[PDB]
Amino acid sequence: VKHTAKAENMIQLQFRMEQMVFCQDQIYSVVLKKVREEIFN
Amino acid sequence: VKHTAKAENMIQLQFRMEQMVFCQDQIYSVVLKKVREEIFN
């Protein structure tokens, strides 16, 4: 039970960090795919 | 002097308008200009 309640709480905690939407300084990798896949190619 | 005075106010005024940025559907072809100089050219 104890370990179960911890995993469950950890999962919700981890989705609360993704919603605040940190726009990272390495998105570039996938920025680049805009001007490759979607326009030039 | 009448028409010097008239001319200058209008020339001042037009620059008063430009501060207020806008442009409707003309801006489309100058994005294509971006498209040509950033990618293909």
Curated annotation (Swiss-Prot), chains A, B:
Induction comment from the UniProt entry of this chain: By type I and type III interferons.
Location(s), subcellular: Cytoplasm; Nucleus; Nucleus, Nuclear pore complex
Taxonomy, superkingdom: Eukaryota
Similarity comment text for this entry: Belongs to the TRAFAC class dynamin-like GTPase superfamily. Dynamin/Fzo/YdjA family.
Record function comment: Interferon-induced dynamin-like GTPase with potent antiviral activity against human immunodeficiency virus type 1 (HIV-1). Acts by targeting the viral capsid and affects the nuclear uptake and/or stability of the HIV-1 replication complex and the subsequent chromosomal integration of the proviral DNA. Exhibits antiviral activity also against simian immunodeficiency virus (SIV-mnd). May play a role in regulating nucleocytoplasmic transport and cell-cycle progression.
Protein name: Interferon-induced GTP-binding protein Mx2
